[PDB]
Design a binder for these strands. Structure first.
Ligand SMILES: [Zn+2]
Lengths: 48, 47, 74, 104, 122, 134, 121
RNA sequence: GAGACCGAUAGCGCACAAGUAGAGUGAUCGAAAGAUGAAAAGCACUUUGAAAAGAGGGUUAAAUAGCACGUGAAAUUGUUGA
RNA sequence: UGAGCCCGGGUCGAACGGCCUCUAGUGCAGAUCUUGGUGGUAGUAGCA
RNA sequence: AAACUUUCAACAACGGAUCUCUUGGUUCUGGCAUCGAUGAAGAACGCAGCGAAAUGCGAUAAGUAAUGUGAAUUGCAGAAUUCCGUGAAUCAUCGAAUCUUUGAACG
């Protein structure tokens, strides 16, 4: 297939509708994020 | 012959001929002093 | 004084000896005009005055230059 | 306008005068007389590199690349997480490549 | 609005004048001279300045000011007679005295608590 | 969304026309709504305001105040309602300007021209309502 | 002191002129007695002048209509009564001369006129 | 009819009684200058003052918005405090 | 580190911001810079 | 100690910067083609109840006729409109008129 969680992460690592970026850190607004940090580990919409 | 007028006092920032009655006049300034020094340096380099 | 009242243009520009207006050239039928002075051209171009008749022409063109009266009038 | 800043008559006063070597409006009976003009740094003067209508407003893009991008956009629209990432509230609708009945 | 906003308006009388065609420097000097004085003493002093009996000391704006023995009243050498500013200040003090009479204060025990001169549009 | 090319969506032209319109266009703009009883009586929503109407001010500081129109001042887009006045410094009463959009017409001044206006508006509304219904 | 345009349209020359003469006399008298206590008399004089304009307009219109009926079947018209249009339109070729065509062209158009035809798909 | 344009030192010289005021014998040269408030409701009346104006009082949500009026920086200035 | 960024208090009244890309008339201490405003000189020279 | 000079603060001044606005400008696109001896463009003098400028008009002079809408104008004063009307309006439309001195300008 042409689509994988790696592909979604690489496409969406820089910009998301959930991504909050400030000087002290980058957070996540995703409801499927257990930590509210932007990472491949905790990207709920990215990981299968 | 040609007189020299320093653009200070009543002669500073004047559109035309000052009150000095003469056939030919030339206004002078420090900017012209620096330009003339540059021209003399160029002439000396040429010679 | 070398410039009096010109009747055609209204300026104090009539050389009394030459009898020629310096602005419009009254004795000449043509009004003095030069392409090297766009500012003077736009000072004395049409639209800077009263527009007595040329202002009323366009309405007649829009309605077709028709003549007569509306039916059932007076 | 191509005539913006050019509709004045100014000339430099000279070199030996204690004033900036800038064109100045002639006259003598108005505030505008003697003021600098024709410069990008002067009030009511020209602007540097005036904007012109020939700017390459449109961009030529290869049709093959246009079609490639359209195909990639279609695939992305098929992908479900990308919809949420773009910002569509897609939680109450199933089958992301959503099809409604033509008769409906 | 007034600069001195720490004084209650029910216990004080206020006077104001704007766009007064009198010299700002002379008016500042005479206002500083009469600052903090009783109303009667200030009025008598201003009338004396009009009558060339007492002189206003010029402290800040006193470049090349003529000397006069009256300056010994202030321990200074440069004193002047700013007559027109004295008249303007007399008018304003009379307005303030009238305001105090209207409010019901005792005019016999008023002091010039605040006085200020600012520049107007030229 | 605008479709016809004759229509302009430009703020500059819209405001210029609104603030430079002549008296007839101003009347059309100062049209005002009718009360509910008049709505089910005439099948008409809004009509241009005039001098002889009785209205109810329902917007503004004057909450629910009824009164007869005294004068319509088309220049600044206001109408004057009877007994809706304020005292000046001298105590002289001056009218308060209320917008026809803020008033609602309770009693309508009846004349042949306005009856014809109502007839035309009602005829158009009922024709289109019948077309939509069947 | 206001005359009605419609009323003035049903009146003969003497009628219009007698009222106009009375109207000018009234204007003169009202001006003379208005120069003192110019008030509602000023308003009446303004209305009176408007009435003068109305009477003059109606007389002129009636006279011009009579002149047009007189010149209805005459080839030359007065320049005032002639239509204005513009200079170019007045100098333009008349419709009949512009539409006039040569006899050979007329014969060709008569015997071979543009036909209607369709081409199938 | 519009604009990935400019936004009162910008955009046409002119957003204003601008080719106006004004200057030149003349050809010609040619400006500056927008904003109270939702509504003038633009401060009744008293007192001082010759007047200008000030102090009370008043309108307003606000006069810390008074037709020297949206907001009101810097340079520069006055008073008070250290 | 920094260019800068964020908050509190006062004023104020009608729009504005963060993030990813795009775009440009995008960053000032000088240019005897342009325009405007204001200083010391100075209550001085001076007002025949 | 005070005065004078300087620094910081609060308040008050001068000034119009900043923010916000915009019946203005600039650029592009589309439909159409219409000045004048039937006296043009332009210049001048007049006309309003109270007007200096701008605007309109021309001794019928902030205007007339006619047509449509249908109850105003407005800073003040004075008249309206009967409203069940050929009829207010600094209204719109516009086919009839008036149009002083000149200006291609023509005894
Ligand atoms: Zn001439």
């Amino acid at each position: 297939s042409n689509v994988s969680a790696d592909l979604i992460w690489e496409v969406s690592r820089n910009y998301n509708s959930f991504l909050v970026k400030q000087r002290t850190g980058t957070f996540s607004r995703d409801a499927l994020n257990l930590t509210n940090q932007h990472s491949r580990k905790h990207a709920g919409f990215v990981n299968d | 012959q040609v007189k020299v007028v320093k653009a200070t006092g009543a002669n500073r920032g004047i559109k035309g001929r000052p009150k000095g009655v003469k056939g030919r006049y030339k206004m002078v300034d420090g900017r012209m002093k620096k330009e003339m020094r540059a021209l003399k340096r160029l002439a000396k380099k040429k010679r | 004084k070398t410039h009096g009242l010109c009747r055609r243009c209204g300026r104090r520009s009539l050389h009394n000896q030459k009898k020629v207006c310096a602005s419009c050239g009254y004795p000449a039928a043509k009004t003095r005009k030069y392409n090297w002075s766009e500012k003077a051209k736009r000072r004395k171009v049409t639209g800077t005055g009263r527009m007595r008749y040329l202002s009323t022409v366009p309405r007649r063109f829009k309605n077709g230059f028709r003549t007569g009266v509306p039916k059932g009038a007076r | 306008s191509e005539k913006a800043g050019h509709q004045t008559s100014a000339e430099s006063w000279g070199t030996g005068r204690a004033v900036a070597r800038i064109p100045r409006v002639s006259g003598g009976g108005t505030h505008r007389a003697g003021q600098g003009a024709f410069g990008n740094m002067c009030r009511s003067g020209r602007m540097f590199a005036p904007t012109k209508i020939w700017r390459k407003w449109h961009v030529k893009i290869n049709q093959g690349q246009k079609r490639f991008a359209t195909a990639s956009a279609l695939a992305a629209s098929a992908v479900a997480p990308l919809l949420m990432a773009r910002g569509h509230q897609v939680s109450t609708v199933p089958e992301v490549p959503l099809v409604v009945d033509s008769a409906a | 609005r007034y600069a001195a906003t720490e004084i209650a308006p029910t216990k004080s009388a206020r006077a104001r004048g704007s766009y007064l065609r009198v010299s700002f420097k002379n008016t500042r000097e005479t206002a500083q001279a009469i600052n903090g004085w009783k109303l009667q003493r200030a009025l008598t002093f201003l009338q004396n300045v009009i009558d060339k009996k007492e002189a206003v000391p010029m402290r800040r704006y006193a470049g090349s000011t003529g000397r006069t023995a009256q300056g010994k009243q202030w321990g200074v050498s440069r004193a002047r007679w700013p007559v027109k500013s004295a008249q303007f200040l007399i008018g304003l003090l009379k307005n303030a005295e009238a305001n105090a009479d209207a409010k019901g204060l005792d005019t016999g025990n008023l002091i010039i608590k605040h006085i200020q001169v600012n520049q107007a549009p030229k | 969304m605008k479709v016809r090319p004759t229509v302009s969506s430009s703020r500059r032209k819209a405001r210029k026309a609104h603030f430079s319109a002549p008296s007839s266009v101003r009347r059309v703009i100062m049209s005002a709504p009718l009360s509910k009883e008049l709505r089910e009586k005439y099948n008409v929503r809004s009509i241009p305001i005039r001098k002889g109407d009785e209205v109810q001010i329902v917007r503004g500081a004057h909450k629910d105040k009824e009164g007869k129109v005294t004068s319509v001042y088309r220049l600044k887009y206001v109408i004057h309602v009877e007994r809706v006045t304020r005292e000046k410094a001298t105590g002289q009463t001056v009218p308060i300007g209320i917008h026809p959009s803020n008033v609602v017409i309770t009693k309508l001044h009846l004349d042949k021209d306005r009856e014809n206006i109502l007839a035309r508006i009602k005829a158009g509304r009922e024709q289109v309502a019948k077309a939509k219904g069947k | 002191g206001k005359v009605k345009a419609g009323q003035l349209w049903s009146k003969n020359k003497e009628e219009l002129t007698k009222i106009l003469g009375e109207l000018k006399t009234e204007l003169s008298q009202l001006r003379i007695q208005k120069i003192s206590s110019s008030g509602a008399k000023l308003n009446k004089i303004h209305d009176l002048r408007k009435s003068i304009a109305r009477v003059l307009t109606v007389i002129n219109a009636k006279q011009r209509a009579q002149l047009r009926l007189f010149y209805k079947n005459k080839k030359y018209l007065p320049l005032d009564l002639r239509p204005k249009l513009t200079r170019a339109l007045r100098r333009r070729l008349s419709k009949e001369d512009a539409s006039r065509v040569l006899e050979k062209t007329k014969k060709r158009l008569t015997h071979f006129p543009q036909r209607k035809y369709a081409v199938k798909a």
